[PDB]
Design a protein around this ligand. Structure first.
Ligand SMILES: [Zn+2]
Lengths: 126, 287, 191
């Protein structure tokens, strides 16, 4: 559980938009009792959802972008000046570290939409 | 070969013949036989239970009478359902219902003939009401010493069967033997009527008579036990008025309370029987 | 051997107590029970044969069993006084045939009618079509005094079965003095 997805992903039953995630709830409720049916422990893999910041600008093209996070490196430890992240393979991120991060000011590619949560978002060429 | 978690589906008629055949022999241990059908490895059912006669050899593999088995199965053939035999059982009223040396001495014969032949033991002594009691036993194969001795899979009924861990001398048989789970299948209509059958005790005999017998006595000589209850009023409450003063001396609770609580509140619940059933007189006497 | 259960019916009607069949119909039908129980014994060991009293109240004192010993005991001191009753006499043995444990035995009834019966033709034809639905084959042997060349009983056996059904045969006592053994000599060789 704690290491699920190499610590990069976790279970999320509630999206930021306010809608519940059906396969995660369905995954964990069938996962409730593993004693009767042992393979029910595999159904929890559906409950795993990726938590990452995806810097994909659009389509197939992958820009190179690094932006700063204000949290200390102690929060970045996954067993300061600026964080080093993708540049979209995206990079893992904590839901608590998504509010402190800021879009790059001096980079050529800047998001048109205000950046708040992670996932895949638009990145506009400036 | 293949081993999976086992469950014994039992019929109430089987359990009835179990404890009935075990109660009539107390203290002496009796010998029965289990009847049912083998559906598969991971599930088993006992749909009937019949009793073997007691002989001079005692409880032994020779105590089973072959001509009794031939005539019983013939009597089962004229009976509605002539199902095939499965396993054996013997009661142990005098002790903690553990398998003895003769029990395994007949177990290699029952495992010879029948593939499974689950051994069941039952005793009346342990609990008078609220426990399944009984017991369960199955002989593990000594030829399995090569491979591992620790199945099954789907540990649900297994890990829940082991608890309490059943003492020491009983789980001293957990080496070379293992228990098996028992569940009560419904058959809800018969279970419900037989539920009310014993409820006739604490409810009423007919659900009418016994508390119309409470309308027979009905305060009658029932004030005599109220006079003894009001003697329990005087007795218990004359030492109950000594308690709160002593509480002020010792400062305060000695933990305690003496209890010396409730009690005659129930006598006032019989006063609810007084007011109700006597208020029925206005309905009885008038029309 | 052939699989079936034969139910023999003695005639307890008051007209069966006369000694016209030597020495007496009591011992005559007793020998008739002797020859049917020993023939079915020589036929198949699995055949179980009980007895039924047709006249007055119908009660089977001997549960259906292959051993005829208890049947031979009931042949004595049977006290066969009463009025013959037909319609119930076949159905009472039919209920005794539905109590058989094994279902592989065919239903077979043998009865003796030695007395004139008041049974209407509508009752015997209702039992005839009822036995047609129940497949029961009944072989009756008429003893005693009755209507000369019995018709309603012959029409009862005729209309009882058909195609083939091989079958129900009726043996009527000939109008002449003869021993009971000579009357049962024909059915034992051929039905
Ligand atoms: Zn014993």
């Amino acid at each position: 559980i704690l290491d699920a997805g190499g610590h990069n992903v976790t279970i999320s039953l509630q999206s930021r938009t306010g809608h519940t995630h059906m396969p995660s709830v369905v995954g964990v409720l069938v996962f409730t009792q593993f004693w009767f049916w042992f393979p029910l422990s595999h159904f929890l893999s559906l409950a795993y959802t990726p938590t990452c910041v995806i810097g994909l600008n659009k389509d197939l093209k992958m820009p190179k972008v690094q932006y700063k996070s204000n949290c200390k490196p102690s929060t970045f430890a996954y067993p300061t000046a600026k964080a080093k992240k993708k540049e979209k393979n995206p990079a893992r991120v904590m839901p608590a570290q998504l509010k402190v991060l800021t879009m790059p000011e001096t980079c050529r590619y800047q998001p048109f939409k205000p950046l708040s949560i992670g996932g895949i978002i638009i990145l506009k060429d400036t | 070969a293949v081993d999976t978690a086992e469950q014994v589906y039992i019929s109430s008629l089987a359990l009835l013949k179990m404890l009935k055949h075990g109660r009539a022999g107390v203290p002496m241990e009796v010998m029965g036989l289990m009847l049912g059908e083998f559906v598969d490895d991971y599930t088993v059912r006992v749909i009937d239970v019949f009793a073997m006669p007691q002989s001079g050899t005692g409880v032994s593999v020779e105590a089973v009478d072959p001509v009794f088995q031939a005539k019983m199965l013939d009597m089962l053939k004229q009976t509605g359902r002539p199902e095939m035999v499965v396993g054996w059982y013997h009661s142990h009223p005098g002790f903690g219902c553990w398998l003895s040396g003769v029990d395994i001495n007949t177990q290699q014969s029952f495992e010879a003939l029948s593939e499974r032949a689950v051994a069941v033991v039952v005793d009346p002594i342990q609990s008078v009401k609220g426990k399944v009691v009984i017991d369960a036993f199955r002989l593990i194969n000594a030829n399995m010493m090569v491979l591992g001795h620790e199945p099954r899979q789907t540990t649900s009924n297994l890990g829940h069967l082991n608890k309490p861990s059943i003492q020491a001398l009983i789980h001293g048989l957990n080496r070379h033997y293992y228990s098996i789970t028992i569940n009560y299948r419904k058959n809800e209509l018969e279970q419900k009527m037989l539920l009310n059958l014993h409820k006739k005790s604490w409810m009423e005999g007919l659900t009418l008579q016994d508390y119309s017998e409470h309308c027979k006595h009905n305060e009658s000589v029932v004030k005599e036990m109220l006079e003894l209850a009001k003697n329990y009023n005087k007795a218990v409450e004359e030492e109950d008025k000594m308690t709160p003063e002593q509480l002020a001396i010792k400062n305060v609770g000695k933990q305690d309370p003496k209890r010396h609580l409730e009690e005659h509140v129930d006598v006032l619940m019989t006063s609810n029987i007084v007011q109700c059933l006597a208020a029925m007189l206005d309905t009885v006497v008038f029309k | 051997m052939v699989l079936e259960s034969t139910m023999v019916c003695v005639d307890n009607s008051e007209y069966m107590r006369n000694g016209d069949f030597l020495p007496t119909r009591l011992q005559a039908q007793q020998d008739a029970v002797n020859i049917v129980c020993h023939s079915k014994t020589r036929s198949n060991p699995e055949n179980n044969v009980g007895l039924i009293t047709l006249a007055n109240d119908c009660e089977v004192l001997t549960t259906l069993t292959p051993d005829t010993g208890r049947i031979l005991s009931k042949l004595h001191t049977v006290q066969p006084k009463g009025k013959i009753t037909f319609c119930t006499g076949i159905r009472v043995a039919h209920l005794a045939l539905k109590h058989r444990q094994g279902k592989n035995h065919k239903m077979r009834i043998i009865a003796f009618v030695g007395s004139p019966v008041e049974d209407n033709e509508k009752d015997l034809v209702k039992l005839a079509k009822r036995l047609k639905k129940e497949k029961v084959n009944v072989d009756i042997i008429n003893f005693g005094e009755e209507e000369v060349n019995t018709e309603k009983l012959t029409a009862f056996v005729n209309t009882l079965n058909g195609k083939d059904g091989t079958g129900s045969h009726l043996v009527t006592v000939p109008p002449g003095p003869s021993l009971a053994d000579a009357l049962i000599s024909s059915p034992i060789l051929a039905g």
